């Protein structure tokens, strides 16, 4: 998967789309606008390098390269930004609907062939490589052309041509007074006709709920940190790739701006002599360190050369039982090692054999690891990792090796000596009861970083000039009320059984 994903939001501008079934309900047009805005915000937060477009059909005015009738391309394929969101915001309400009607109009005819032609033309203009081509149809008219059959045939032919080109088509059908029926006309235009998507739907599509669900977490495409060589010995070498399945998420780096006109500035660092005033490059100056009441002077090149031990890669040392590995010896986040057949042919077979035998014998490969040049070596353990799938066969644990760093003698710290006091069985039983009362299931994606979420919310509020920032609920805060209700009296019994009458833990 290489390139960018392009999406086009086709929104019908027919009269039937501007009628609300109930007074306290959202019109289909407003729902489509809200979905587009949500997708825009999600793309800005997650993938800012993607391309989006917004096109309307069935209007009175037109704006397109080919100069068709009743097709107004509101926004062409361009990276998302706050300006487009603000522009779309002027159609959200009823006054926005009036503004949209005045600007473009509604109630005119249209031909789906022209719409698809305009979409294809928009796709062709983009110069960047596009991994995905996608179009979404926000409409509530299952029979766009019932009076004319030639128009339907032309639309079918254009949809087929687009499908052959490699353009995905999706139908976000909206509520209809009568009921949407895909079988009428949209069975062929839509790229994939699901078996369940054949009955008459009396409610908006379920995909709108997914679209409205804002995702405020960055998405990174698969990439290899390094492509190194595993050396069983001097003459047996295979090629492996290293990946970081877990990586800390950081706020985007701040940028320095000028106060007067918000124009970015450039920061430069320089070093000058005090007694002469001249400028010194980072080669005239030396390095120093005061040991034993004396000064030791080393050049920069020598200082860098102090760290040269061995060439980059992994060197095999032996195999160790997994029992000897310790959980509390954590030093650094682990990495993932996978075969890489491009550099060396035959690496995959040996890697698979090693993984199978390591799983069978429950052993881990001890290795010496050197990520880059002029970096001191470390001792790592490659633990086999089998392929684990979930109920729906979606892979949850890939096959390969888990690279875990092992601490040196300097990475451990001595602990103060503390006398051991053992609790009586009754206290342990009461604590067991409390623990059982406070039991819950844990998942790796059950928590979110409050700082990053609040930062994203504040940034969006500032960019869109919203009245107040949206407040993010913190799921990491203990539920004091629920815990108190569940525990009941157990806390009092434990405190009576473990603490003297006058202890005052807080004090």
């Amino acid at each position: 998967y290489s390139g960018r994903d392009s999406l086009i939001f086709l929104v019908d501008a027919s009269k039937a789309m501007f009628e609300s079934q109930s007074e306290d309900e959202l019109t289909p047009f407003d729902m489509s606008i809200q979905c587009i805005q949500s997708v825009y915000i999600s793309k800005i937060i997650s993938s800012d390098r993607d391309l989006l477009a917004v096109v309307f059909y069935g209007t009175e005015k037109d704006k397109n390269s080919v100069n068709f009738k009743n097709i107004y391309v509101l926004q062409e394929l361009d990276n998302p930004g706050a300006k487009r969101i603000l522009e779309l915001d002027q159609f959200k309400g009823q006054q926005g609907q009036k503004r949209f009607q005045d600007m473009m109009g509604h109630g005119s005819d249209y031909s789906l062939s022209e719409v698809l032609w305009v979409c294809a033309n928009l796709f062709s203009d983009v110069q960047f490589k596009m991994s995905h081509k996608r179009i979404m149809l926000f409409t509530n008219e299952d029979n766009p052309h019932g009076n004319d059959s030639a128009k339907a045939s032309r639309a079918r032919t254009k949809a087929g041509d687009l499908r052959d080109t490699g353009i995905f088509l999706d139908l976000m059908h909206l509520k209809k007074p009568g009921g949407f029926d895909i079988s009428l006309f949209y069975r062929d235009i839509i790229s994939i006709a699901e078996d369940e998507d054949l009955r008459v739907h009396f409610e908006e599509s379920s995909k709108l709920e997914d679209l409205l669900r804002k995702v405020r977490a960055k998405e990174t495409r698969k990439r290899a940190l390094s492509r190194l060589k595993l050396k069983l010995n001097k003459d047996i070498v295979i090629s492996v790739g290293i990946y970081n399945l877990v990586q800390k998420a950081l706020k985007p780096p701040p940028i320095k701006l000028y106060r007067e006109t918000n124009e970015p500035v450039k920061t430069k660092t320089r070093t000058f002599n005090t007694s002469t005033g001249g400028l010194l490059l980072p080669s005239d100056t030396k390095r120093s360190q005061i040991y034993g009441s004396r000064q030791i002077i080393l050049e920069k090149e020598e200082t860098e050369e102090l760290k040269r031990f061995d060439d980059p890669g992994l060197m095999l040392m032996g195999f160790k039982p997994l029992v000897l590995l310790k959980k509390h010896h954590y030093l650094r986040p682990s990495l993932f090692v996978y075969p890489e057949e491009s550099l060396v042919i035959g690496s995959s077979t040996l890697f698979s054999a090693l993984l199978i035998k390591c799983l069978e014998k429950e052993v881990a490969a001890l290795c010496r690891y050197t990520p880059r040049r002029n970096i001191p070596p470390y001792f790592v353990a490659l633990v086999p990792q089998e392929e684990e799938l979930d109920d729906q066969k979606i892979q949850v644990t890939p096959p390969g090796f888990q690279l875990v760093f092992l601490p040196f003698a300097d990475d451990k710290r001595k602990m103060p000596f503390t006398e051991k006091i053992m609790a009586t069985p009754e206290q342990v039983g009461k604590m067991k009861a409390i623990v059982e009362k406070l039991r819950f299931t844990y998942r790796s994606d059950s928590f979110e970083n409050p700082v990053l979420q609040q930062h994203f919310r504040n940034l969006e509020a500032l960019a869109l000039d919203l009245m107040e920032p949206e407040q993010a609920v913190d799921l990491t805060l203990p539920k004091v009320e629920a815990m108190n209700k569940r525990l009941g009296s157990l806390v009092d019994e434990f405190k009576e059984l473990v603490y003297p009458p006058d202890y005052n833990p807080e004090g």
């Binding site: 998967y1 997650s46 995905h132 997914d210 995702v215 729906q392 819950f440 299931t441 799921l475």
Partner: peptide, 23 residues
């Protein structure tokens, strides 16, 4: 390929974080 993220093709959709839910 059920569960694929509509917003981001090629990435598996992630369920909303539920925090702690006692049994």
């Amino acid at each position: 390929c059920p569960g694929e993220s509509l917003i981001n093709p090629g990435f598996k959709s992630k369920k909303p974080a539920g925090g702690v839910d006692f049994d």
